[PDB]
Amino acid sequence: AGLVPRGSHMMEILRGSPALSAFRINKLLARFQAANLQVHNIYAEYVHFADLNAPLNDSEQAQLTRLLQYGPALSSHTPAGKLLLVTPRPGTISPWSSKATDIAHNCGLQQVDRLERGVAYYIEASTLTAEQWRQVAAELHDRMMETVFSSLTDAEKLFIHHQPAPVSSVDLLGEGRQALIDANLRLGLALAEDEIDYLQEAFTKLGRNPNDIELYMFAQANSEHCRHKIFNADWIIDGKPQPKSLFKMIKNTFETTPDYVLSAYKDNAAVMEGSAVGRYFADHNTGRYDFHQEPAHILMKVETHNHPTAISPWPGAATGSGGEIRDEGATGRGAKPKAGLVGFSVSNLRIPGFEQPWEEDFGKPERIVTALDIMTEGPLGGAAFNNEFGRPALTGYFRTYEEKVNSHNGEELRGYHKPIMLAGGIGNIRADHVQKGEIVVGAKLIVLGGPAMNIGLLDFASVQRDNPEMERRCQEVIDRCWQLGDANPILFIHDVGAGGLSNAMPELVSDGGRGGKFELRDILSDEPGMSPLEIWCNESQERYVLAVAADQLPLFDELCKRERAPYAVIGDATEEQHLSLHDNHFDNQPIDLPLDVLLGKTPKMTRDVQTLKAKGDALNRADITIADAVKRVLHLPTVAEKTFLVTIGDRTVTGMVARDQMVGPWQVPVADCAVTTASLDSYYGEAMSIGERAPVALLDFAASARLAVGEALTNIAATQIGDIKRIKLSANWMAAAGHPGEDAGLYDAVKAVGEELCPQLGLTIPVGKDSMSMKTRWQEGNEQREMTSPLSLVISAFARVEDVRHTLTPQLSTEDNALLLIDLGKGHNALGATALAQVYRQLGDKPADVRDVAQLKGFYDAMQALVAARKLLAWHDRSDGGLLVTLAEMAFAGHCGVQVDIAALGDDHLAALFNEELGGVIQVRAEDRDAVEALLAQYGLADCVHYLGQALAGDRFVITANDQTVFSESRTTLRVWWAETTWQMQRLRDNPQCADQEHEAKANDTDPGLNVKLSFDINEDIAAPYIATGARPKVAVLREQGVNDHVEMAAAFHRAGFDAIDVHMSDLLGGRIGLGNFHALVACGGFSYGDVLGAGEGWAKSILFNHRVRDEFETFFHRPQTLALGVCNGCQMMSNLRELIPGSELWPRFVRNHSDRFEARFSLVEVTQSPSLLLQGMVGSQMPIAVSHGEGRVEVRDDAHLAALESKGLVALRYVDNFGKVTETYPANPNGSPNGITAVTTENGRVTIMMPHPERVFRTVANSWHPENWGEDSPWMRIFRNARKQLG
Ligand SMILES: Nc1ncnc2c1ncn2[C@@H]1O[C@H](COP(=O)(O)OP(=O)(O)O)[C@@H](O)[C@H]1O
Ligand SMILES: [Mg+2]
Ligand SMILES: [Mg+2]
Ligand SMILES: [Mg+2]
């Protein structure tokens, strides 16, 4: 390794591993070929850079080298051709750096000041002008985040230490108002004239110049984004002043329906009542996990991240999720996120080679990315945060829309060049923490979370950065705090978002009626160059602010240190309502303002506007046939199979997921809503649904809003809730404010829901948000061009659930059955702004709408009655794609056919099939048909209800009208058409061989779906005689920073009769726990250190390189009767500890999945013959299990080691396909493991490691699909019971 001076430090250069798999290499050479760059070869190697504050000895040096060996064992090559080194941009620090540096430090390498990584490309192309070489460089890096260098030694620039820049005053006293004008332009404050006036007066009054930092702070606080001027404005519309602001109209819903609401409009989340259940967590005093029977109340929030996603979609989506997760955690006095949702709206995908006939290239601004790039990288970013933080992503929407239409302002381009990137979620909260506490004078004011950098200030300022593992460490602290109940030391907590500390700290003291005084140099920073303005105002991620009483600081400090969550006390709350920021380094005072000056307002806005309303035009059906329409509609991404957005995101973490997107044996993503259990011990729960219908707003603003509320309801309706007043909404409003017609449209739509529909249904909207510049302008040759969004209301619905077991899905039964349409359209059959119109490049005439409020209410209540009485076999609502899609999706999910007659739905068959009016199809038992129709009739629905026919075994999808066949096709053929979008996305994003295997398996109708074979009685609690003695052996539930499934792991061992003890690696390191006291160990899953330096490696190496902790592990494993289990991240960890584990010499490594993608799957495995004591009695069983990993591929050293492993009989689980054979085809085998291997054991059988998560599926109710007759325990419960019985 290289070692040179880097200013006051030394920089070491260490060569790492080959970086690109063969299919990635081929993709690059293919891209070079298509651009006419004649490249003979390309090879890439990771390279690591260590900036050292003192030397390493030989032992330490060998440690560092070893830390930096990871990754798949790809073919290595001696370098050749021209070097192009890609690194993060100078002045930035990669999340990889943050995590890898933490590993070095936890391995005792304090000398390592910072680690960073690049990629060295070696390109052989002996032609190539220098012009072409810049094109080559351009293809190998992301211009928003990375730079390209010619030497390895250039990485020195990444570690330059700049001296702290001083505060700068803006010279109002010396130049007058011109100085504020100049600063406004120079610093991009975007101040209005009246804000310049207020600032000029405030500072004239104080008699001194404002500092740059004070102006910036004021500018961020008073932006549209932070102040919500539009939503608080007075309105005049068509000449008449209006009585309410938009905000007041939303609040009207709470004044009408306060029921169940605990908190609305006074926190960064709403809270509603949940259920009394067993809240499961480890006691502060014993470290033991125990159930605490108490209300688990339900918080909800939804946010957007639209602008940054247009610039840098991966971090834009990741931090959109990250911001939202902080809002949840900082609700009240601390709360716990549970499950998430995700939304995207983009322009047309225009997938190379898969152009669809409605798509036209209209151009875009150079400075934004394409719709395709957003849908490639954005969902990966959103999922990276949810996976590595550890909340399951259980529902979502994805719409594409880009067309030249005759809308409210005449002919123009309407679309989503600036996308919607939506993230939201639910969490749980204790009753006594729902209310923010008061801030005592002298309260310590703390920043919890990550060291700041210059983020948020070619738009580099919109390039965000995510570190989910940092946020997980913070959440653990928050959890520790709320888990102390009455001794929770958190007095007040708030997230840090827009404006950074300059917004969050003033907001916090002000919400408590206090001031604060702050010390700039107490704030944690990874960028010593930063000005006070940059420190105070940057939008660095994973930070929270809180207030704690001075006498609780020692407790807080203990809590943070055990979690490894960084924190700093940065000031004190004062009685005086003044804000002071001091700088110890420059000995001065960057901020010194009364709060009333800083937080004082300009006058509220008045919007005086007028109504525009499109006529819109009858659908021209010249080129439309029913058959062609079916093919086109199934190819609209809006309609099409969403797998590329679903399997990339964990859907099992917490162990509380009852209903995820994937439905049935064939795991078809058509679930209409998400459902979680409230605890690990209850069937009470929570549900999430989304409704949205933006294109309708191009014809009718209020109908678009009414339909978003309506579809939220129709998506959630087959979940057992009861009173509709249990359902609470978030309303997120996206608009191009100021665009002609949109303002009046916005007012009308908000009124349509806030003043009319929601009050009439009894639906509260206790939370919500707005994004008001949904348009993009650019110059496109000669001309000005503009792409403006429709008004885009996204409704998310949230509800307490009475029994999660009674949820229906779209999965049709083929037992004797009746299919009934509930047509809440009442025969209007509207076709305007449908998927059908869109796919023929039209807007059409009149859209759907809520036709009858009482009937919508009735529909809901009748569904609730049918659900509760168990009278439904299946449900699927009608939305994009109409009845045709509803029926098709039900057939896909049931893996069957339908025989339906539409003669009663009107003579216009096209309109009957493709209207997107509210309603849906219920399936009931044939014998229940008359009673079900009677029930519906007593809710006023008889004329909306139509018997369609039946679901039948087979492959025929048949629609008749009297004796005419309207449409007939192979259900498989439709299902594979419907799959083509996700196929093409997967194919261009992931390993094409895997995308293609997954796609091609859909075309095989003989696939029997997930199915089980059990070698034992699932219901026999073999641990019960032991549990009945009341002797409860301990299990060390072992977690490292970033681990996230430790709670449900504990619960599984607990159900089997153990006392589950929380053992953090910090507990082992500080002697608080010794393994000598345990007979059982389990290393849990998650993303320890964000998987940086190879999944499980930092965890393992921190054990190996500390000799004491290492001896402790080794001793545990060499005892004669100890048991250990490693699951997922713990399997990876323990595989890196072979040297401590007897009988583990043939164990493989676990590396990047062959798909090159995180795989969240419900996969079929079989239990194989091995010594594993944890699998006793189960050999020959086949059943599905939760899978949730990116690095699960078994990799051996060579074939000799694979054969040896196999011959020793150590393989304990294998992936099988649905025909029951061992497989390596994807995704049946989700990772590419040879011989399906996904668990191995030791020779003595006492240690077992496995990639899947049995702890996530020990409850039948948490199995995405399961046989109907199972009781409460899944087969996987037997693992934990086998461990108990084995201990005796
Ligand atoms: N962006 C997304 N992320 C995750 N899941 C999504 C996303 N978009 C859609 N889904 C899921 O895919 C399935 C189909 O979506 P969609 O057809 O939009 O739902 P619906 O038509 O019932 O409103 C649903 O289970 C939905 O939650
Ligand atoms: Mg759909
Ligand atoms: Mg639906
Ligand atoms: Mg929808």
Coordinates of N, CA, C and O in Angstrom, one line a residue, residues 272 298 338-342 392-397 424-426 646 650-652 656-663 669-678 684-691 711-721 796-805 807-810 875 877 1261 1264:
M272 N -53.6 9.4 16.1 CA -54.9 8.9 16.3 C -54.8 7.7 17.3 O -53.8 7.2 17.6
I298 N -51.3 5.6 17.2 CA -50.8 5.5 15.8 C -50.6 6.9 15.2 O -51.5 7.7 15.2
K338 N -43.0 2.6 12.2 CA -43.4 1.2 12.0 C -43.3 0.8 10.5 O -42.7 -0.2 10.2
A339 N -44.0 1.4 9.6 CA -44.1 1.0 8.2 C -44.2 2.2 7.3 O -44.6 3.3 7.8
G340 N -43.7 2.1 6.1 CA -43.7 3.2 5.1 C -44.6 3.0 3.8 O -45.0 1.9 3.4
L341 N -44.7 4.1 3.1 CA -45.3 4.2 1.8 C -44.5 5.1 0.9 O -43.8 5.9 1.4
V342 N -44.7 4.9 -0.4 CA -43.8 5.5 -1.4 C -44.6 5.9 -2.6 O -45.5 5.1 -3.1
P392 N -40.6 -1.5 6.9 CA -41.1 -2.1 5.7 C -41.8 -1.1 4.8 O -42.5 -0.3 5.4
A393 N -41.7 -1.2 3.5 CA -42.4 -0.3 2.6 C -43.5 -1.1 1.9 O -43.3 -2.0 1.1
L394 N -44.8 -0.8 2.3 CA -45.9 -1.7 2.1 C -47.0 -1.3 1.2 O -47.9 -2.1 0.9
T395 N -47.0 0.0 0.8 CA -47.9 0.4 -0.2 C -47.4 1.7 -1.0 O -46.5 2.3 -0.5
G396 N -48.0 1.9 -2.1 CA -47.4 3.0 -3.0 C -48.2 3.2 -4.2 O -49.1 2.4 -4.6
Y397 N -47.8 4.2 -5.0 CA -48.3 4.4 -6.3 C -47.2 4.9 -7.2 O -46.1 5.3 -6.8
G424 N -44.1 8.5 3.1 CA -45.0 8.6 4.2 C -44.9 7.3 5.0 O -44.3 6.3 4.7
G425 N -45.7 7.3 6.1 CA -45.6 6.2 7.0 C -46.4 6.3 8.2 O -47.0 7.4 8.5
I426 N -46.5 5.2 9.0 CA -47.1 5.1 10.2 C -46.1 4.7 11.3 O -45.1 4.1 11.0
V646 N -41.3 -2.9 -5.6 CA -41.8 -3.6 -4.5 C -40.7 -4.6 -3.9 O -40.5 -4.6 -2.7
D650 N -37.7 -3.9 1.6 CA -38.0 -4.9 2.7 C -39.5 -4.8 3.0 O -40.0 -3.7 3.0
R651 N -40.2 -5.9 3.1 CA -41.6 -5.9 3.5 C -41.9 -6.8 4.7 O -43.0 -7.2 5.0
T652 N -40.8 -7.1 5.5 CA -41.0 -8.0 6.6 C -40.3 -7.5 7.9 O -40.7 -8.1 9.1
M656 N -44.3 -7.5 12.0 CA -45.6 -7.1 12.2 C -46.4 -7.0 10.9 O -47.5 -6.4 10.9
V657 N -45.8 -7.4 9.7 CA -46.5 -7.2 8.5 C -47.4 -8.3 8.2 O -46.9 -9.5 8.0
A658 N -48.7 -8.0 8.1 CA -49.7 -9.0 7.8 C -50.1 -9.0 6.3 O -50.2 -10.1 5.8
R659 N -50.2 -7.8 5.7 CA -50.5 -7.7 4.4 C -49.6 -6.7 3.6 O -49.6 -5.6 3.9
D660 N -48.7 -7.3 2.8 CA -47.9 -6.6 1.9 C -48.5 -6.6 0.5 O -49.5 -7.2 0.2
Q661 N -47.8 -5.9 -0.4 CA -48.2 -5.7 -1.8 C -48.4 -7.0 -2.5 O -49.4 -7.2 -3.3
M662 N -47.5 -7.9 -2.3 CA -47.6 -9.3 -3.0 C -48.7 -10.1 -2.4 O -48.7 -10.3 -1.2
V663 N -49.5 -10.7 -3.3 CA -50.6 -11.4 -2.9 C -50.6 -12.9 -3.4 O -50.3 -13.1 -4.6
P669 N -48.1 -8.5 -7.2 CA -48.3 -7.2 -6.5 C -49.5 -6.5 -6.8 O -49.5 -5.5 -7.5
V670 N -50.7 -6.9 -6.2 CA -52.0 -6.2 -6.4 C -52.7 -5.9 -5.2 O -53.8 -5.4 -5.2
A671 N -52.1 -6.1 -4.0 CA -52.8 -5.7 -2.8 C -53.2 -4.3 -2.8 O -52.4 -3.4 -3.2
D672 N -54.4 -4.0 -2.5 CA -55.0 -2.7 -2.5 C -54.6 -1.8 -1.3 O -54.7 -0.6 -1.4
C673 N -54.3 -2.4 -0.1 CA -53.8 -1.6 1.0 C -52.8 -2.5 1.8 O -52.8 -3.6 1.6
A674 N -52.1 -1.8 2.7 CA -51.2 -2.4 3.6 C -51.8 -2.6 4.9 O -52.6 -1.8 5.3
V675 N -51.3 -3.7 5.6 CA -51.8 -4.0 6.9 C -50.7 -4.5 7.8 O -50.0 -5.5 7.4
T676 N -50.5 -3.9 9.0 CA -49.6 -4.3 10.0 C -50.3 -4.7 11.2 O -51.4 -4.2 11.5
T677 N -49.8 -5.6 12.0 CA -50.3 -5.9 13.4 C -49.8 -4.8 14.3 O -48.7 -4.3 14.2
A678 N -50.6 -4.6 15.4 CA -50.2 -3.5 16.3 C -49.0 -3.8 17.2 O -48.3 -3.0 17.7
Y684 N -55.1 -7.0 16.4 CA -55.3 -5.6 16.1 C -54.2 -5.1 15.3 O -53.1 -5.6 15.3
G685 N -54.4 -4.0 14.6 CA -53.4 -3.5 13.6 C -53.6 -2.1 13.1 O -54.4 -1.3 13.7
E686 N -53.0 -1.8 12.0 CA -53.1 -0.5 11.3 C -53.1 -0.8 9.8 O -52.6 -1.8 9.4
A687 N -53.8 0.0 9.1 CA -53.9 0.0 7.6 C -53.5 1.3 7.0 O -53.7 2.4 7.6
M688 N -52.9 1.2 5.8 CA -52.5 2.3 4.9 C -53.0 2.1 3.5 O -52.8 1.0 3.0
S689 N -53.7 3.1 2.9 CA -54.0 3.1 1.5 C -53.8 4.5 0.9 O -53.6 5.5 1.6
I690 N -53.7 4.5 -0.4 CA -53.5 5.7 -1.2 C -54.6 5.9 -2.3 O -54.9 4.9 -2.9
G691 N -55.0 7.1 -2.4 CA -55.8 7.4 -3.6 C -55.2 8.7 -4.3 O -54.9 9.6 -3.6
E711 N -61.0 6.8 -3.9 CA -60.1 5.6 -4.1 C -59.3 5.2 -2.9 O -59.1 4.0 -2.7
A712 N -58.9 6.1 -2.1 CA -58.3 5.7 -0.7 C -59.3 4.8 0.0 O -58.8 3.8 0.5
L713 N -60.5 5.2 0.0 CA -61.6 4.4 0.7 C -61.8 3.1 0.0 O -61.9 2.0 0.6
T714 N -61.9 3.0 -1.4 CA -62.1 1.8 -2.0 C -60.9 0.9 -1.9 O -61.1 -0.3 -1.8
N715 N -59.7 1.4 -1.8 CA -58.5 0.6 -1.6 C -58.4 0.0 -0.2 O -57.8 -1.1 -0.1
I716 N -59.0 0.6 0.8 CA -58.9 0.1 2.2 C -60.1 -0.7 2.6 O -60.1 -1.3 3.7
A717 N -61.2 -0.7 1.8 CA -62.5 -1.1 2.2 C -62.6 -2.6 2.6 O -63.6 -2.9 3.4
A718 N -61.7 -3.4 2.2 CA -61.9 -4.8 2.5 C -61.0 -5.2 3.7 O -60.5 -6.4 3.8
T719 N -60.7 -4.3 4.5 CA -59.9 -4.5 5.8 C -60.9 -4.2 6.9 O -61.9 -3.4 6.8
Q720 N -60.8 -4.9 8.0 CA -61.8 -4.8 9.1 C -61.5 -3.7 10.0 O -60.6 -3.8 10.9
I721 N -62.2 -2.6 9.9 CA -62.1 -1.3 10.5 C -63.2 -1.0 11.4 O -63.1 -0.7 12.6
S796 N -53.5 9.9 1.4 CA -53.1 8.6 2.1 C -54.1 8.4 3.2 O -54.4 9.3 4.0
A797 N -54.7 7.2 3.4 CA -55.7 6.9 4.4 C -55.0 5.9 5.4 O -54.2 5.1 5.0
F798 N -55.3 6.2 6.7 CA -54.7 5.5 7.8 C -55.8 5.1 8.8 O -56.7 5.9 9.1
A799 N -55.7 3.8 9.3 CA -56.8 3.3 10.2 C -56.3 2.3 11.1 O -55.5 1.4 10.8
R800 N -56.9 2.4 12.3 CA -56.8 1.3 13.2 C -57.6 0.1 12.6 O -58.7 0.3 12.2
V801 N -57.1 -1.1 12.8 CA -57.7 -2.3 12.3 C -58.2 -3.3 13.4 O -57.4 -3.5 14.3
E802 N -59.4 -3.8 13.3 CA -60.0 -4.6 14.4 C -59.5 -6.0 14.4 O -59.4 -6.7 15.5
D803 N -59.2 -6.6 13.2 CA -58.6 -7.9 13.1 C -57.9 -8.0 11.8 O -58.6 -8.1 10.7
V804 N -56.6 -8.1 11.8 CA -55.8 -8.2 10.6 C -56.1 -9.4 9.8 O -55.9 -9.4 8.6
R805 N -56.6 -10.5 10.4 CA -56.8 -11.8 9.8 C -57.9 -11.8 8.8 O -57.9 -12.7 8.0
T807 N -58.7 -9.5 6.5 CA -58.4 -8.7 5.2 C -58.6 -9.5 4.0 O -58.2 -10.7 4.0
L808 N -59.3 -9.0 3.0 CA -59.4 -9.7 1.7 C -58.4 -9.1 0.7 O -57.9 -7.9 0.9
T809 N -58.0 -9.9 -0.3 CA -57.1 -9.5 -1.3 C -57.8 -9.7 -2.6 O -58.9 -10.3 -2.7
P810 N -57.2 -9.3 -3.7 CA -57.7 -9.7 -5.1 C -57.6 -11.2 -5.5 O -58.1 -11.5 -6.6
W875 N -61.8 -9.2 -2.8 CA -62.1 -7.8 -3.3 C -60.9 -7.2 -4.1 O -59.7 -7.5 -3.8
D877 N -60.6 -3.2 -6.0 CA -61.4 -1.9 -6.4 C -61.0 -1.6 -7.8 O -60.1 -2.2 -8.4
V1261 N -49.9 -15.0 10.9 CA -50.5 -13.8 10.4 C -49.4 -12.9 9.7 O -49.8 -12.0 8.9
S1264 N -47.0 -13.6 4.2 CA -47.6 -13.0 3.1 C -48.7 -13.8 2.4 O -49.8 -13.4 2.0

